[PDB]
Symmetry: C4
Subunit: 343 residues, 4 copies
């Protein structure tokens, strides 16, 4: 459960959608006027936020903002530009820029700079290769049907379009090769689809792997640091655990694990506190662990564990947990007894 946990992400989305509702031709005066003024108000809310950021050079503990401020700058300045420069009806186009804000929430863009950054001698090379296949296809298609269909295969651009249709396996159905050689050639084109199709995917494979891997220094190094338990484990041991550990922040008054809900892992608390729906309500603070009972005996959730407040939790798999227990029998002993304490 994730309700009110991300206050900033939740509010922006409706504003983003309003841009589309407005952009409809032949709309009545009553709706269009209201919607148009709304963007000005949304723009103003962002404008207010900007002043706080522009004016303020303090963040508290740790933060860095050069690439990020620029995104914010473009987002607010553009709507302003359209409003002032354009007295005309079509300035709503400029309001599209809010699309950029979602870039900020995600892990991938800062990481991508780097994904793109260390593997592009090969990555660009593959895309350039792609341009080549497309061009070759345009040439091959043009030569075969130019006499029969001056209208359809009249020019290279027309043939290239057919390739666009065929190449990504979209196909329109408006243009087809009447001739035998043409269909056989298509058989080769159909096969070339194999190489092309693979391209779309190999790229994401690396970006996503690295993106998850990065959470390891913050969430699995600094975050783990909170749990004193991890101190006895070796550097080599930690990395395996580090890839394994995962993170979320559960909102207050919500339930992390329902009572009796199958429990095949345990949760560690980094920040915030949780409450255990037990004979003796137990509040767990940072560095604490729960649901270990579930692993030691194999039974579901011991108690409904509810995050009293927004709390950051780490989870350990039964496979991983066993590794912890074998490494440190004394620690395993601690979980067994602590578990008794929870129930």
């Amino acid at each position: 459960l994730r309700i009110y946990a991300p206050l900033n992400a939740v509010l922006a989305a409706p504003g983003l959608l309003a841009v589309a509702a407005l952009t409809i031709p032949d709309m009545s005066g009553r709706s269009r006027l209201a919607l148009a003024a709304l963007l000005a108000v949304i723009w103003g809310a962002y404008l207010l936020q900007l002043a706080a950021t522009l004016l303020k050079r303090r963040a508290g503990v740790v933060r860095d903002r050069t690439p990020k401020i620029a995104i914010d700058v473009l987002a607010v300045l553009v709507p302003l530009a359209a409003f002032l420069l354009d007295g005309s009806p079509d300035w709503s186009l400029y309001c599209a820029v809010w699309l950029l804000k979602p870039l900020r929430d995600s892990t991938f863009f800062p990481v991508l700079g780097r994904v793109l950054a260390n593997e592009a001698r090969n990555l660009i090379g593959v895309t350039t290769l792609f341009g080549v296949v497309l061009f070759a296809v345009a040439l091959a298609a043009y030569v075969i049907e130019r006499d029969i269909q001056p209208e359809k295969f009249g020019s290279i651009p027309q043939a290239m379009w057919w390739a666009v249709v065929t190449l990504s396996t979209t196909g329109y159905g408006d243009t087809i090769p009447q001739s035998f050689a043409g269909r056989v050639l298509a058989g080769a084109v159909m096969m070339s689809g194999i190489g092309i199709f693979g391209l779309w995917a190999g790229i994401l494979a690396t970006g996503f792997y690295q993106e998850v891997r990065r959470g390891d220094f913050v969430r699995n190094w600094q975050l783990v640091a909170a749990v004193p338990l991890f101190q006895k484990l070796g550097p080599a041991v930690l990395v395996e655990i580090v890839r394994a550990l995962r993170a979320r922040t559960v909102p207050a008054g919500a339930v992390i694990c329902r009572i009796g809900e199958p429990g095949d892992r345990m949760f560690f608390v980094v920040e915030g506190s949780v409450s255990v729906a037990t004979p003796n309500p137990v509040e767990l603070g940072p560095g604490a662990f729960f649901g270990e009972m579930a692993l030691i005996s194999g039974e579901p959730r011991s108690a409904t564990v509810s995050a009293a407040t927004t709390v950051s939790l780490l989870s350990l798999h039964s496979a991983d947990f066993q590794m912890l227990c074998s490494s440190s029998p004394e620690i395993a002993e601690i979980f067994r007894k602590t578990a008794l304490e929870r129930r």
Copy 2:
């Protein structure tokens, strides 16, 4: 060989299909009445099953059912609602809900709960990014062709449809850019398909991996526990073997390994018993192993080994088997001699 192994899975399917046959317009009086009454009978069968579950809070050994009961409840109550409230012909729609039942047999949903559960700060961000890309394309396409085709590109929704067609690589062929800039733009869209296309796939990569991984605590920890052989092996050693071990339940009188069929692995028996088609018919119970002869000597199946009854088997790869043998020479010695025993 899987025949009568899953008694519940086999029966539900015909009922599921019948919902579609009924939903055909302009059907004759004779057939439609009969098929319509069938749903009431199937509904009743489920109703009977529900009473057993609702009424009974007892199971056998260990079981947990909160998320699951709700599914069953919705599946039966809805058909009821349609039958009573609606005397009208179109109540067959309500019978669709049986599609929910298949969710229950699979490993994916409870695990998915977790897959979605610990990786969605990034996952949602990706989908949100996607909504944005679709929107940008709608705007871009509309601006270029509005004057030429008021009929086709007259409005954003119309442009958005083209994007739907192009984006997933489906393409209808009823709409196409007539202008040079439009086709060039399509070239970027064609490329943007690369990122989009990857989205569909990255998500499944993690869920499926985790789903197989999960079988490890039950099938590869508790299940292995049955074989006394695994006790010597270290915690570190077990995980590699654990990922490697796989499971099924072979039904009675069926053949697990046809005699002379190639034997490149061995089978371990957790539950049930098996029979070996040899000079001395041998019945193997839980914790027992067979086919080892095949591995020690490299030979095909020693005997037709048939499951006398429904039996749960674990199998070990030749690569993995060697690891077992190297770790414990005495165990390797045992398998060689046991193997003599089987033949």
Copy 3:
């Protein structure tokens, strides 16, 4: 280079294609008769081969053929059945069965039996789930547009067809949703493609991995056995090398490594012999290794190494080679001196 190495594979192919040339309607008497008679002759050649296999239960080295014989049986009996039963022109359809021969050459079916065999409690579950989504889409699409287009959406199967078109991202262009609800629904359908799309691919990921892995017992256990060099290395060490080692057979008089071609790996000879184009032509037999010079000094191929005859070779990567050298300094010393011998 692969030319005459696979004699059986080369010959079957032309015959396989001939089935299609014959099937074309309104062909002249002169050509059609000739092609028709050819199948009878090809059938006869296979018939001769069958008698050899049926009559003979001898192999002379080690072999197993129950599942395989059945394929051969069906392939020959069917053409026979059509020839005798049908004096009619359309018996060429029966000749299609030769397509089964290709299954025999490949690694995948015997393995697939097994891939399907230990993972289907989950794989079937996913496919059945897929049927459910398809059905749900048919229902949702039908209800929305039945009044407007009784001709297009008049029935469930008409709607189902649209689903087939949309679902695999094929899209014909003939049918589209005019209504607002329909296009928005399409947005969900567009997203549902994510799950559908990954399905096609997740399955192949497992079979192909396993298929390559399997060559390890034959090629990387028994095959390695030939090289005395591998004897010193530990069971744990061998598996890493075993995944790494790869195999082919290079035909006689051909070049394995053209002289001065880059040499970033070395080759081991299991069967057959090779010749080294050097000051002292050197013939290497089984258990021998070459191109080690290339790794020790980093230089390209030392000499043109050509297989005098059909030879089976294993190759070791530079990363892997270093591991071999670090494990056994004495062995590394041997490769350096042997290398001097080659040059």
Copy 4:
């Protein structure tokens, strides 16, 4: 940042594009003449380059070129052939061959020779199976609709085209099965899309993995060698680091890491030198390392580090860095103090 880093790659591309600009039918006298002459000049530039290469058999440090020269030979000779033999307007087709030049800049073709080289006994087998499935569909589709649509399903090649459309999930929309059996069959065809579609992708999975892996002998062995730091680490330790290490060449006067930009890794310098925007400008030569401060304390880039000149850099991830530090506490000590030196 990559600007003037690749001088040869940058210039060739415009020439490649001009081939398409010329090939447009019904163009004016003024433009077509000029563009046509440009190819002759570009051809001449390449001709000039070839003479240097043909004439010169010496490079500098270390090089090889048999397969590569042939590519260059074909590229230059063909345009010449068209120029001399063809006085006619359509000799621009011959200019397409420049597409080959991009093959040279990439990792994949030499590696592909090898990817194709050790795994094609299986890869060809997969494709052959594919050709067969296509044929089976042609036969199946023809038989069902031949009487109803003699014009559409009149012949096998007409049916085969439908298969081309359906199989790659392109679909034109011009041809559809009217009959019930045909649509049901399509459901199986739709599902067969699972296997086919995955084909396009499994191939790239291995080539790409190997392609990145190869950079390890040059970049991660030779690159490792420049840094004296890597000498202490064990052979087993190096491979994990080797896969992890990545490379690029940042051009002169550009910024490697912007000041204050986040610093979650460090950079090692193999060739060239860098300058640190610090109190005491520091120039780092080969074997040197920077950004370690960022890792030791976790803070962003210490100083703007700019490559004074074209410089080749290696980077170490925080997870990997910790491994380095744990293996050699004294080295960790060195980085902490060196880091102080940088700031």
